[PDB]
Design a protein around this nucleic acid. Structure first.
Ligand SMILES: O=c1ccn([C@H]2C[C@H](O)[C@@H](COP(=O)(O)NP(=O)(O)OP(=O)(O)O)O2)c(=O)[nH]1
Ligand SMILES: [Cl-]
Ligand SMILES: [Cl-]
Ligand SMILES: [Cl-]
Ligand SMILES: [Cl-]
Ligand SMILES: [Mg+2]
Ligand SMILES: [Mg+2]
Ligand code: NA
Ligand code: NA
Length: 326
DNA sequence: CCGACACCGCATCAGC
DNA sequence: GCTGATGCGA
DNA sequence: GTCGG
């Protein structure tokens, strides 16, 4: 973090545009800049120097000069002191409360953790659980704990059906020393792009994980995506571990590589790679990579037998997971 | 200039 | 009930 | 907010 000060500033700006301005493109613009700057191997000495990087334009360049000179940004100095913006940014930290619900609550006089707690009847299910674990979800997960969680999930999944294959993706697969949550990609031979010869595939696993008291709550649950909460079991007299967010995605067995590519991320890396694909005339999603006919319509799925294959199509040299943390 | 900006699952809603 | 639009995941 | 054509 040679340019931590600058990347943080950009991220704060990004969050403001997203949560308060509800301006998604400005949000992604700031995030892109923060990203490219974060991997820049030098201690930025000026905005001009930064403007050389792709994604950093005139505005961010001037902002970087202000920052380098004063150590702060007036624009943010202001935003920080605006109560409505401050309340809004805060409420969006609760899982399930977005920019819209956040602004709505602020309109109704609900702007503090305290307020949220005394108005649970005004929250939907997800938001209710997000509030419950507000503190816990703010904590990072040491890789060591991810390893223990991985063991349980794979072993429990195995027990349900030896034919299940559970892979931990997200930041964990990228080699991070800490993770915001645990993301699990799941496959089973009975569920392919061709057919679903067995129902309740995801349910059965969620079921088992709940039985062994690993999954404590559910934020949302469908046929192929589970979003919930889990906790590692603690020892006698040992204090309890924090509750953790867990995402489970059931993907067609024959679309594993596109699935693992997607779920490994990062989200910004996928955004960059998917944009490059488009420039190259392809479209990539968690299921497949399809060509783009002049008419704009996507074509039939191209054959894929490795993450690398996807990279080859868009003429990108393969990049290891550990190098996709953009 | 100015249009494009990655992609999609599940919860919840309004209109029918 | 359905379907389409929106919010949120993120 | 930034970019390519
Ligand atoms: O906007 C998104 C969000 C997620 N994803 C993919 C990539 C990401 O790495 C993966 C898992 O989502 P998380 O939100 O769990 N992020 P990640 O695991 O990378 O980091 P963290 O440690 O915060 O969980 O899903 C996208 O493609 N787009
Ligand atoms: Cl925008
Ligand atoms: Cl600042
Ligand atoms: Cl695939
Ligand atoms: Cl597809
Ligand atoms: Mg994650
Ligand atoms: Mg996740
Ligand atoms: Na630039
Ligand atoms: Na939130």
């Amino acid at each position: 973090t040679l340019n931590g000060g600058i990347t943080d500033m950009l991220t704060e700006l990004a969050n403001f545009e997203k949560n308060v301005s509800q301006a998604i493109h400005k949000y992604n613009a700031y995030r892109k800049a923060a990203s490219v700057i974060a991997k820049y191997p030098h201690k930025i000495k000026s905005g001009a120097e930064a403007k050389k990087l792709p994604g950093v334009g005139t505005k961010i360049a001037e902002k970087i000069d202000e920052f380098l000179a004063t150590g702060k940004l007036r624009k943010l100095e202001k935003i920080r002191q605006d109560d409505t913006s401050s309340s809004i940014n805060f409420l969006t930290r609760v899982s399930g409360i977005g920019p819209s619900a956040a602004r709505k609550f602020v309109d109704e006089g609900i702007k503090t953790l305290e307020d949220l707690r005394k108005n649970e009847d005004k929250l939907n299910h997800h938001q209710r659980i997000g509030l419950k674990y507000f503190g816990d979800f703010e904590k990072r997960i040491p890789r060591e704990e991810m390893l223990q969680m991985q063991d349980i999930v794979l072993n429990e999944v195995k027990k349900v059906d030896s034919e299940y294959i559970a892979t931990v993706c997200g930041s964990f697969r990228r080699g991070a020393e800490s993770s915001g949550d645990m993301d699990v990609l799941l496959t089973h031979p009975s569920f392919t792009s061709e057919s679903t010869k067995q129902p309740k595939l995801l349910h059965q696993v969620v079921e088992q994980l709940q039985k062994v008291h690993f999954i404590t709550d559910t934020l949302s649950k469908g046929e192929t995506k589970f979003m919930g909460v889990c906790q590692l079991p603690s020892k006698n007299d040992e204090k309890e571990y924090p509750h953790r967010r867990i995402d489970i995605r059931l993907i067609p067995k024959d679309q594993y590589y596109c699935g693992v590519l997607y779920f490994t991320g990062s989200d910004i890396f996928n955004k960059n790679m998917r944009a490059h694909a488009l420039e190259k005339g392809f479209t990539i999603n968690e299921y497949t990579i399809r060509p783009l006919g002049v008419t704009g319509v996507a074509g039939e799925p191209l054959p894929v037998d490795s993450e690398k294959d996807i990279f080859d199509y868009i003429q990108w040299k393969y990049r290891e997971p550990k190098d996709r943390s953009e």
